[PDB]
Subunit: 228 residues, 6 copies
């Protein structure tokens, strides 16, 4: 008996990701991370179908007031999408129109025969799946993010959405109602850090890491599914 | 075998909603959207039992400090509830006492034999349920809301709570610890917008819509349950 | 057939909690409530495995910027953990190193045969589980919390995380990247309040409560699992 | 008598330049800037000071720069806010652009004064008298703060002429964007000092909801005054 | 020639403060610190006449919307006033009506012959006035404050408002539109700290201070006027 | 002539003391404080006022007290922000501590003036002339606001000398912490008044992204002026 358990997967590229072994495709879409309306951020759990929308837009929502008037793309609102490895233009100027497409991640919504969860090692080692559970994928421990106005959202640490397959310092792009997208200097990604068991309660040693050593302090994860 | 999957439904009226096809009643209540304490908003997923409380109050919570003192209805805190089609009084003054009753939406918490999800078309078209899933209800794509201090919360786009059966410009009412409720000019509802496939990457065309044309730009949704 | 449903339980003590009736242990850990990075709070549902981390740290995360530079414990960021009955030191000075250990709650992540939920009475009386659901535990209705910058997070009222077995005016402690933990005067806990059925729509009667009468206005809850 | 260079700014709340009040002299005119909002953070100008009077209007009067030595102008989602005129919203209620913005923007004068200038507030429907030895520049209504997008905003110093607006307006300011649009939005709030009777100071305030024809019954009055020399 | 320079003084008691030597009285009032409307704080400079209102109220302002409707004391807004040495009631419950009077500070707005400024020692010693400037009063260096929502305001360090004559850990009280006032556990005062010249560019030594030793780390100030 | 005690503060944006402008005399020197952030809320000092000039630097120049009569100094996660020098970030990009912080911190002078001091802004690349009867103190770039941690920050009064920085810097301030560290962070933004053409005031602004070598092509100029006596 298939009960309709769900798992969402994000390619972090322009390609449709395959559903992991033992699961089946329902539909593909574009990777929505969060929206920002009237300055207030609201995010989707990356492990859930709500992060996977059939249609992209820089402005995928509208707002309505108590006077029964609705406004679409008519203020200063934002959308944020998981992004591909596509580099910023040399100009560093905002991206518009069809030029936006190579920057947006794709996703799969998959039906699973059992419950799906994430486990985190908090080390450079891959955490094993709990006894009785098999592996769907391995990745990096993704916890939260901020951009405009230091607003943002985050992930549930037991959800597959907290286990991104590709580590990226800049895993999302910012888009506006006016039709532009860009990366901005205030965009932060937050990842679970590595911790040695002996050192749990001791003062953390501050570290600043550069390209080539970023993942030396990033926790690893595995997305697992109950064997039936 | 029943595993205890749940779905919550909101009437957006004074009457109890009926449980959708193939599900059974657990209990009814009043439709809690969010609370705001010490200026900070915290919302409930409208698809979960947490948005359905047995008892209403303008102040359904209290707060406690590190000095072991608790305070109930003794500051400037808020509660927010899904509302009915009841219009504002002519006076536009705050509503009190038994006069609040006609304004508050009812809900049903129902047990389901399988997982329940929402899908969104992002068009005026009704999106079909995935193959193998049956229809529970059809509605309008509800994403987030803001009120006092531009604080608020939103819905999980995979949850039944992101699919409201009646579109309303003003779908919720603001209540206070002091016992008053009202609609305020800064109350905003946010809904997923309609997008044309060929125009996904193009600049959104701004639109200001009035009564009669509001739903011409509102995404449709369907709530679905795996057939067993 | 075991589908891999999950329930997380928090001892609110230095000891591992036992898995509730009819469930089995997956792993134990420390009780993570929320994190705060670049001043923005992000919480974990206390009913989910995300609130149960194998390894403690005052700084369990790092951040990365668009210039491919990551920083660990190198700004002014926070972590928050459910706490034990351990009193503040007489000095009221921040706690460091091994002295932190007696303050941090433990958790168990447990595999269940069926779905788990919480129900709330909104009275001093115990709410019964729905028919066909078995009792896992009884507690107090925990909704929301705030600390530094009045930032915080909250619980899903349908989740076991909204049902804490021991009432505490101060149920959580604040930790910092610099390695210190403490209770601060601005730490607030929010709980569901008691409501009389006949008085639902009436003006709430304000009340200030001291030690000995704190629980007289705190809603009770029960955590329930579908009988299979 | 030495002129030390005391300043007072006046706002017409119309498309026409205001005149400098009696006993003061014009320095320059401009447009009435209320506040700006960059990276979601509001920062306001005291309406009594020359900082609220800019020579050139724009929907985007500022740019931002980052630690990587890159600056961006009108290239995100930032705002500017200006005191507005009696011009009504178009019936479409759609954002205003280009030259259609001009009728909505208030004008200002920066004036040199021979002495210090202050505002006083009655907290009644009556005009408060100037202090002994001070003469009147203008009368108006007690303006304290305002909010718009994200409930961000700013306010006035109650001793400043900026807290004393000559025309009462439920909606005294308009919102503009980097993209070139301006509009009134349903979340735009103006805050004014209320009328308080001396007998009711330490009594529970009586809640009141007021409509057109009735609004100013609860709005505090003010006078802007200048020391006689 | 008297040019009309102003200085405002706060008694921090129920008594009218006297205008300092060389100055003359214009009027007296009650000490307004800040207001909070639609959750946004806006403060008055304590050295200026704007912090001295003729009439007290728990709600000294109203708000108006774009529909030409104004609301007075009809939501959840705040006012904050400098307070007296009057202790919190034993009950710790909100204070109403005439009972508020013993808690509210008084002020004087005074005309001065010349400019007035504050200087700060950043030591426990009184800083001398600049040469050519004479003393108005001495005090403690007051910088900022926070209360509900961790909103607040602060003082200009060149203003007499940054130099409070009486040190208080809780120098202000919180009032509400509903007519209640109280001290709350999240109310913070911030003061300039004592810094020794040779320790300026060293790691600050953390310190937690109790009653009897609070002022050992509080910077002193003097308010001065140019001799003419 | 009677000296009434008008004040003007100047910031070197270097480790050298700035000189008081001609016509003014020194009161004292110090370090350039921009703003503080306590319990996550920012509060700034007007850079034109003596409040922005503290005798003694510290990474933590304040403490906080609670209603239980307990005060805490450098015992949470609070911040201070200071105007900075041309000193580059170290190659490691790691937090700076101890005496190594000194090369990064700007110095300031508090000066007594015989008359009122103001700023004017051109909103072009040209220097705006002082008003009639006002003499020049310095020229600079129009600085309006700034943000850092939590997108909190503060700004300048556009009539104040604080809105007129003598040296343009994309990163004009550094962030320090109660724990004793300072650094530049990727989210630190500076906001400057932009150049506006008179013919383009009401038109849609043209978006621009500028790199090193062209940053100042869109930054407004200013002059700080003093009334002649
Ligand atoms: Cl928009
Ligand atoms: Cl940027
Ligand atoms: Cl309340
Ligand atoms: Cl309203
Ligand atoms: Cl840190
Ligand atoms: Cl504290
Ligand atoms: Cl912009
Ligand atoms: Cl609107
Ligand atoms: Cl109110
Ligand atoms: Cl409290
Ligand atoms: Cl600190
Ligand atoms: Cl950084």
């Amino acid at each position: 008996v298939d009960h309709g358990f769900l798992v969402t997967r994000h390619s972090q590229t322009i390609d449709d990701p395959q559903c992991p072994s033992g699961t089946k495709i329902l539909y593909h879409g574009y990777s929505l991370l969060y929206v920002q309306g009237n300055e207030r951020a609201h995010g989707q759990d990356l492990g859930t179908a709500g992060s996977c929308l059939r249609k992209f837009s820089t402005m995928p929502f509208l707002f309505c007031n108590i006077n029964n008037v609705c406004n679409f793309a008519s203020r200063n609102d934002y959308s944020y999408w998981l992004s591909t490895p596509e580099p910023m233009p040399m100009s560093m100027a905002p991206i518009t129109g069809e030029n936006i497409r190579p920057f947006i991640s794709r996703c799969a919504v998959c039906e699973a025969p059992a419950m799906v969860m994430a486990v985190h090692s908090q080390t450079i080692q891959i955490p094993p799946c709990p006894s009785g559970w098999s592996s769907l994928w391995i990745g990096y421990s993704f916890v939260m993010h901020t951009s405009a106005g230091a607003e943002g959202s985050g992930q549930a640490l037991a959800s597959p959405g907290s286990c991104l397959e590709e580590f990226r310092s800049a895993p999302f792009i910012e888009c506006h109602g006016r039709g532009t997208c860009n990366y901005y200097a205030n965009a932060y990604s937050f990842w679970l850090a590595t911790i040695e068991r002996s050192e749990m309660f001791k003062k953390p040693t501050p570290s600043t890491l550069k390209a080539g050593e970023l993942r030396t302090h990033v926790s690893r994860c595995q997305v697992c599914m109950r064997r039936t």
